[PDB]
Design a protein around this ligand. Sequence first.
Ligand code: HEM
Ligand SMILES: *[C@@H]1O[C@H](CO)[C@@H](O[C@@H]2O[C@H](CO)[C@@H](O)[C@H](O)[C@H]2NC(C)=O)[C@H](O)[C@H]1NC(C)=O
Ligand SMILES: *[C@@H]1O[C@H](CO)[C@@H](O)[C@H](O)[C@H]1NC(C)=O
Ligand SMILES: *[C@@H]1O[C@H](CO)[C@@H](O)[C@H](O)[C@H]1NC(C)=O
Ligand SMILES: *[C@@H]1O[C@H](CO)[C@@H](O)[C@H](O)[C@H]1NC(C)=O
Ligand SMILES: [Ca+2]
Length: 595
Amino acid sequence: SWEVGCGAPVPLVKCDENSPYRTITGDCNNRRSPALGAANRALARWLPAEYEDGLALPFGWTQRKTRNGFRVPLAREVSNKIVGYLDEEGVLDQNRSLLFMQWGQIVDHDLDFAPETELGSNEHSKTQCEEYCIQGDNCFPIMFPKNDPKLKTQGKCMPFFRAGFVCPTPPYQSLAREQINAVTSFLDASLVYGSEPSLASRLRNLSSPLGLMAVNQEAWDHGLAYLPFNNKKPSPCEFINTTARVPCFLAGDFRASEQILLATAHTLLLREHNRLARELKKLNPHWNGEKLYQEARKILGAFIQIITFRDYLPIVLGSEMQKWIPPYQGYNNSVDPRISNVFTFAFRFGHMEVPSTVSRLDENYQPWGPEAELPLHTLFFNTWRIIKDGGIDPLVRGLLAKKSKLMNQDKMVTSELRNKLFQPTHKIHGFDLAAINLQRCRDHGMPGYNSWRGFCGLSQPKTLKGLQTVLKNKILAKKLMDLYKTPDNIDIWIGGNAEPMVERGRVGPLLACLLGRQFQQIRDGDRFWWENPGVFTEKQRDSLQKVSFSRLICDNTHITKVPLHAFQANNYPHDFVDCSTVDKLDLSPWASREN
Ligand code: HEM
Ligand SMILES: *[C@@H]1O[C@H](CO)[C@@H](O[C@@H]2O[C@H](CO)[C@@H](O)[C@H](O)[C@H]2NC(C)=O)[C@H](O)[C@H]1NC(C)=O
Ligand SMILES: *[C@@H]1O[C@H](CO)[C@@H](O)[C@H](O)[C@H]1NC(C)=O
Ligand SMILES: *[C@@H]1O[C@H](CO)[C@@H](O)[C@H](O)[C@H]1NC(C)=O
Ligand SMILES: *[C@@H]1O[C@H](CO)[C@@H](O)[C@H](O)[C@H]1NC(C)=O
Ligand SMILES: [Ca+2]
């Protein structure tokens, strides 16, 4: 027997089936199996889960219990000995702009979100976890090793709560624990519109019938829109500067304000929806509000797909791209489009691409004022620097003109994220994203590094010398052996990211495999993929292949000079051209005559 029975919180709807538009939840994409790839279902498992008790407890929960005969090393200790470095000189990617990093986070937020178990506020378990580092139920603390400076300064532990899971969330249920994906698995701009009907409707402007999204009423960026403010107090974005009291932004995805460049990207997309809707009204004065919203929505979703598959993936995957993602042959209704649990850790390669500072540049692409360059840690949940300190254009220019960090085996994750991460629930700039990622691998029941190497048809090193050869690094292999004892025990997040990069790419072979298969599936298993015959007309498709990120900047900012290939490293002024040189999106193929 399978167990396709269980499935409790879900939002079930009736499928229209002749609708030319996606649902908000992702239901009804697959006609035979309507819940496939919908939000608020379990992440898929390409391999069976690996928990300490076979069902739900993570490896490292019970100290007595080993993994393959060895204790698993503390997440924070792996972080200290392997992931950290001091010297930011020499660490930048010479042929990837900052936007390369930032597009990755957008795509990843469209595809997956496994929220923490909540149980609501008004609980003393949030105190008990934070205050006393007491493991149990959903509290699974990251303990500091001996000689950690955070011991002196912070406490015994970083609090950490286990991820939510399907059926029930309070008393559990049986078998193997399966984490939830709270967004739609399809690349569909769910991060802009929401993955739930409640939220999607709240994001819309339903006073006017122009199919527009709601915009801020308290603040303008030289007459351009800002996202609306989120309702909710306590607001993490006002906590970081109680004098400015600028709240977080409200968007289709809950993490939109996590850092300032993510909020910036979200603002561009909202702007583009409104631009598109008002252009479509011009051409089709008879279209109602709904039709404008959906039709703009459909274009925007196609834009994300195109940028992602044409410009971004080839420069992640490099020479592996063709091997995993062959040319499109049409919609395949037998393909599983769901995001897999392991993908949500594979795609965290981006954490190693984040540099330590962010810049604001002026109209000649020069430092914008005296405090132009800011440490990244001051910009988590920071909206006041947008509203009170220049709007988005200076941040957008920095995206274009500055570089991503290069993954480096000796310099993996900046300290801005490794020691000074801010979490919305808590009050300190003191968390470790690397340690959280490792702890989360265990929370989610990840098989180890060698299981995934075998999955991908790659060799499985068993010795120090085997690991040296795969990593092509003696010192890194040895530090890994001293902590983990067997390469079978190496957590997937760090194992995958430790491999040298493939030719023309920015991930290694294991990751290229994991990423590559996932992206093949969400393309092939999507009935509304933009090239799937009948989704758009030939002439609409012809118009859509001219989109570029550069054009999106030009249309939705006051920036006049942009590069043509925004993801590669570009110098000002030589690589910068005037916006009037950049191909526009021609919307005349959306004109709808009567007679
Ligand atoms: C300054 C930039 C960024 C910050 C501050 C940030 C922060 C975070 C945080 C706090 C989490 C939750 C971790 C957990 O509890 O397990 C997370 C998850 C994630 N991050 Fe990032 N990150 C950033 C950039 C990126 C980039 C560039 C990518 C990809 C290219 C990325 C991909 C992801 C993914 C896939 C997850 C898992 C989401 C899920 O399914 O729940 N991140 N990140
Ligand atoms: C919903 O859309 C309407 C119509 O576009 C917005 O109202 C206009 O917005 C500008 C800026 O606030 C004003 O100068 C006009 O007074 C408004 N025009 C009309 C015809 O009402 C409205 O702000 C939108 N609402 C939200 C929350 O975004
Ligand atoms: C930068 O990357 C682009 C796009 O992947 C590539 O074609 C170009 O040759 C690269 N530049 C350098 C200097 O290697
Ligand atoms: C708080 O914001 C105000 C402007 O609202 C600014 O002048 C001040 O620097 C900010 N303080 C901090 C500590 O970020
Ligand atoms: C569609 O996908 C299935 C399962 O992944 C695969 O075996 C088959 O080759 C594909 N079928 C078609 C008709 O392309
Ligand atoms: Ca989605």
